[PDB]
Amino acid sequence: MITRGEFFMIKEMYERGMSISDIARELGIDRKTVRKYIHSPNPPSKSKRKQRKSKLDPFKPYLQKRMLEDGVFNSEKLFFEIRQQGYTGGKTILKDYMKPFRETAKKKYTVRYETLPGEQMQVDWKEVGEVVIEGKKVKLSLFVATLGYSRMKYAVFTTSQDQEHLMECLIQSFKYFGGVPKKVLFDNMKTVTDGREQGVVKWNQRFSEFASYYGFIPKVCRPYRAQTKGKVERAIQYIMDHFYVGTAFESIEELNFLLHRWLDQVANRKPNATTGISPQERWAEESLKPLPLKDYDTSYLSYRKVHWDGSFSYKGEQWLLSAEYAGKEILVKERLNGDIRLYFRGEEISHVDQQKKV
Amino acid sequence: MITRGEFFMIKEMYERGMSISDIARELGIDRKTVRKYIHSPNPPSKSKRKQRKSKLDPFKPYLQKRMLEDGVFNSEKLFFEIRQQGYTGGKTILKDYMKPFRETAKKKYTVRYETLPGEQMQVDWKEVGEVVIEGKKVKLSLFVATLGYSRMKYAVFTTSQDQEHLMECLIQSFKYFGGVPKKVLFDNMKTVTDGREQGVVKWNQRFSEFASYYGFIPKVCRRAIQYIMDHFYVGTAFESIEELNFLLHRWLDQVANRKPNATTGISPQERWAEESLKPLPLKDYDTSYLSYRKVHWDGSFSYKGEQWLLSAEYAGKEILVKERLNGDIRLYFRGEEISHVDQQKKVISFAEKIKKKQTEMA
Amino acid sequence: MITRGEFFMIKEMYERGMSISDIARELGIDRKTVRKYIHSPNPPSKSKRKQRKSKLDPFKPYLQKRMLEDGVFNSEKLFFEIRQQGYTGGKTILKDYMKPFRETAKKKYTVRYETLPGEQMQVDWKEVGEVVIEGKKVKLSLFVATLGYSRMKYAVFTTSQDQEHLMECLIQSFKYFGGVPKKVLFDNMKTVTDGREQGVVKWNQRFSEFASYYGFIPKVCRPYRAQTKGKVERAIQYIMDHFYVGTAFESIEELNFLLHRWLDQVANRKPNATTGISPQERWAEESLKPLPLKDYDTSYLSYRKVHWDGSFSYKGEQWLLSAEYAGKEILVKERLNGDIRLYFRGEEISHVDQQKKV
Amino acid sequence: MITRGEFFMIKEMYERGMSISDIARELGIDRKTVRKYIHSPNPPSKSKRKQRKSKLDPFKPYLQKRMLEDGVFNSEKLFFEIRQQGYTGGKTILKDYMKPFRETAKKKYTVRYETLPGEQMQVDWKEVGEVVIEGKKVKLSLFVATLGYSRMKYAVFTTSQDQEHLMECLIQSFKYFGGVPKKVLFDNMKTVTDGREQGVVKWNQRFSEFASYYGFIPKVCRRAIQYIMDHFYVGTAFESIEELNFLLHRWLDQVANRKPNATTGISPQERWAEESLKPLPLKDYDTSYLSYRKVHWDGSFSYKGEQWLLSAEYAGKEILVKERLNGDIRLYFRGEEISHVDQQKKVISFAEKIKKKQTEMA
DNA sequence: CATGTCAAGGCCGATTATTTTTTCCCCAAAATCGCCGGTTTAAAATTCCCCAGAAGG
DNA sequence: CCTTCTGGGGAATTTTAAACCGGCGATTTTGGGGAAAAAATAATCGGCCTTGACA
DNA sequence: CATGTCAAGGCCGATTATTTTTTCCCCAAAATCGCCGGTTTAAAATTCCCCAGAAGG
DNA sequence: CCTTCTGGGGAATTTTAAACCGGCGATTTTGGGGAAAAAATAATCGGCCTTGACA
Ligand SMILES: [Mg+2]
Ligand SMILES: [Mg+2]
């Protein structure tokens, strides 16, 4: 099959009026081919034909069943399996036929969705790994909060993912935004959800009362479907692939301060690809309504019996309580920072006098 | 030879009643020349001399080989070579014998032929300069087609010199001139040929399809632009590209294609009127930008910064996004055209399209 | 610069004896270029020149320090970092310069080694994942043993990686091979090693006495360097990428039997790439010396006080012991399979009479 | 014209003492023709007639354009065209005027020229059949070079028709013939040109370097093999390829290159003796298979099934593994040659090389 | 002594089978080209009258 | 002193050569059908090289 | 209501700067080609003697 | 009856035409140097599209 140059030359020659024989002689082409290409508006082209039958055709349904349902993409395993079924072919066929399927595996169809301003705050955790601070190992964890409409990323590094730490980071994110969105999206975790009841979302009483105090509602997604919170997950693959990779830190406060400056610099004002607008100039389009702060900092610790005069001794210091506690046993809760609380039957004692009779 | 009139007179005198021998004695010519020319059926014209043998006939095949394949026309190199091969002649013979072939070879370079009606259309490009459209700089380009015979010029401003703009401007030129010419010749450029090797050219696929659809043949082989720029663009007021093209076409119709040449004294209009352009097809070629685009598994496929969302039926596949020069986008999936999605000519954020599809589906 | 075709044509024409001017006219090339190419044994070529200076050159040492020591390969992070240092360039330079480094990162140089016959048996574990058998979840684990010289892979699926299970699988592999190699290579695990002592390999007393009983020596590799046992690790990436992917099983014995048949079919006789010889025809070139089998199947369970007559009751059945145990408390060890043992002060009682007085 | 002898006699008679008027009266020729031819310095030869005007001179440029660019030589198409353009003549004029150009164009196809000494070497390939070497089948191929002038044939058996075998066999042919010819012409094949487009050819890089190192030029343009196979290979006993090549060269030296042609009556040996081959360079080209190979980070890089181990200095890089046809392997890393690793011609397992390096390093 | 290894997938090349395209051969019909002879046109040559110079009555 | 002859120039006609036109014979070209060969595309089989994954 | 998303890397194209190659113009020198005239060679034509046929003394 | 003239054939020489050789004049070609333009390679900057990763 001659190429486009020869066809254009032939058309030129005939339009010039030359004899077919002279065209054939000069172009080194037969006269009949010249004739064919005279009256042919279609120039030479690859002209792909229809795929014909193949040795693998009768086995293709089984190959598809193995590939999709079972999930097999090893060329030789399927070759061995179908050799027992009468396959009289080689392995390159199987590799070539399977290449598209293995290239397009574990990929479903997904529905893109955007929510309304101030009505979806995605929140997620991440165990970054193991780091050494002051010679002591710690399992550091990112906590990330992304506002759905504005994509206003906020992140904080913590040492534990306890309920108290979760609530503290959530409040920090809220005051960072300036308001509490009505719906907060989370993942299936013990703190957020006690469990499941026949596919019914369940939330812990503590978290429910916390949210009622702060006027938001959890909206945990489908179990085992963590793709739902794509915003926060990709905000976590941005922090990790832009900030942590190459970060030098010595103190946790230093790292958090580095992260917040990095956020305000590039993470909160870089024009988002999908929205095309900087997050900071859409962070003011979300309804806000803040509230004061509260916490439940407590640790189950030693007890002390209160004398009949209302005085009890702790670490050599004298503490006086109301006469109602005289003769009863109380729980003294001292944290590593020196904060001291007193409890009785699980209720915090709000009135305490510290008489420094050392 | 001898006078023909003498031969005819001798024949008549023999037929007059005079003995041949007496004729020979009187005329001082033998009786047998008289006898030979008496039976002459026709007058003795130029003697038939048969291929007088020369002094280089044996080497004629060698010299022809040299000239026609080796290409050597000097009369000294080959003179020495034939001397080595046993040549007993001189130089004038070789010079005279090669002179026809020498002039034939020279004529290959004296290309001073005239283009005949409808034969070829010469096309030229140009960077007009730098202009600002909607606050963005752009290197606008002039595109000038020129009929070889009528000399008329069709000029237009286009942002890009890409293949699609080339095809659209060729269509416009054919419409303006009322038909198509046999051959269309350009300057060596990527949109036409994918390189050349000094005598042969590798034509493009889409360009060749276009050319054979409009019945012309491309030709990239090895001023009007500068005149247009010096006489129209300089000192011209315009704020729109469409208005500028309108003004250029008006100027062309008034005082460019109707400007008589000093030598010929005829305006281009009459020359075009006496021109032969083959008809133009009933419909026009689809010069829409042809671009294959993979559609992500979420349906979001991006084209020139605009991310369109499709349905799950065609997610994960590659589709041909034909973009018409006007701005309309047509998506074809394995030949089966898909519903024309919203094509409002206002670049909008992808989240807006997410919302649009989310509300439309439900 | 003309191409090879033009240069060859020019050489042809001059060898033919043509004038320089005629060559120039016919080829459409200037006479001086023709002259240059007449006497030039070097034909036209790409002729790559030397790379010149670049805006990024003064910053390249810092980029290399970030890439290798810190380990940063994000284009924009380094762009931002070096923009503050006076970089007046774009980002494509940085991406292009960094592409080779990111393509060749986390790759050291490694020394290939082969050991002598019957002197290295690599052994490793793997937690395959979570599977459901009879409606009950189980954390299945591969145990793989590869003989260094023969590459004679053996594998067994287990439900736990306890010390007893480890020893049982090791013995099964040994009897599969027919002999105990002198050196057995393991990984840093609690069962194999109690701990570390200033970079000194330490082994548990139980495992040490076990190996002495079976006449082999542990040869645990460098800590944190699990690359040392490449043979077993790739034997584990062969089982997973050839057998488990697409395996249907309902009972653990069925799965182990499937695996052993698959081994004997393709895993033990497929010609190894490096050695070029089937493992089965080099499995007979390794020294062997087996020994009988032993185990420590015990479970800490309930106790029973022995009466003064030597009889004690368990689950309604009467058991008689030697008079030495009269009046003492013993430990009855009953497994789920009904195996019953008796212990006293940690020592198993070997003499017991079961009087079925039900 | 009139007789020159008459003019000379008249001049002498006037110089003899006879009045011009009396001469005119006697000869029946005017006195003034006599006067004109009396002062003749040289005899009156062919009259100088100046470019007799024809009936198609205005159209001569058009006809030349048609013939030399359009290529149309028919005397009917152009006859009608010139009739349209106002042609008042006939057909014989056009036929005769084109006959020179027609025969010149025809001569482009009557390629019946003789190859002169040393000019071109015609090379041909062949699949000899199927043979078994060391228990493995192989499609051996014959390679036959042929001098255009001397007609001698150099034939050799090679397993592969790859480029390196081609270069080695060309070197052997040049050594056998004692020099190199100007041009070497092959059949269209991948090892020489990367495709052609009917008039132009894209030569290879290594092949061109080789050709310009041995001072010849390739030429792929558009029997001896079959004779060799029918007269030597049929009914031949051999168990080695080297022995077969030795026997073929012996046969060529005895009764193939010394077999007189019936027509010429001369053996090829004398024709070669009277041949001009340009000298051969002092050294030979390196036709070692050029293959770039990435070296894994463990130093194990594989070539044709053999996995060699290198040192950490060159681990992770790509090296050029030049394989000489003999079997030796030379590794070059960015120009700096590396120590020639063990190259025993016995394919050995990779574990053996692991052991070798492990014991050598320590 | 401590030392990383093995396999799978993809790509390239070669071989075989089917389909499409190109090339070659024979018979019949048509068209064009070349050579020779005759005629026509253009160019060249020759001859016929007046002015000037030289020679002879 | 004068007359005649000769030489040169101009115009017209004739002759010769070249070119042009028509007819005949030979050769070449074009169209259609059949068979064989070559080229292009798709399918099939085996081997080699490099990279990746569990660590 | 429940619905996956965002960024980074690589590639392509365009623009700018530096280096290499190619092309063009002017002056001086050298070589080759073409035309005209003269000479030589080959081919063609013509003329000069013997045999045959026809006509006239 | 016979003699003379005419026609045809063969050979040699001469004439004409074509071709060949040498010299002169004109034109074309080649080599070197300088300047300008174009092409190729390397470097630089911005944008777009697709894929991958934490889930
Ligand atoms: Mg492990
Ligand atoms: Mg998560």
Residue numbers in the entry:
A (entry chain B), C (entry chain A): 1 to 358
B (entry chain D), D (entry chain C): 1 to 222, 234 to 373
From the article:
Here, we use biochemical and structural approaches to define the molecular determinants by which IstA, a transposase present in the widespread IS21 family of mobile elements, catalyzes efficient DNA transposition. The IS21 family of insertion sequences is a particularly widespread class of transposable elements. After screening several candidates, IS5376, a prototypical member of the IS21 family found in Geobacillus stearothermophilus that is highly similar to other members present in Escherichia coli, Pseudomonas aeruginosa and Yersinia pestis, was chosen for this work. By comparison, IstB is a regulatory factor and member of the AAA + (ATPases associated with various cellular activities) family of ATPases; this protein is similar to MuB and TnsC from the Mu and Tn7 mobile elements and is essential to capture the target DNA and recruit the transposase to promote efficient strand transfer.
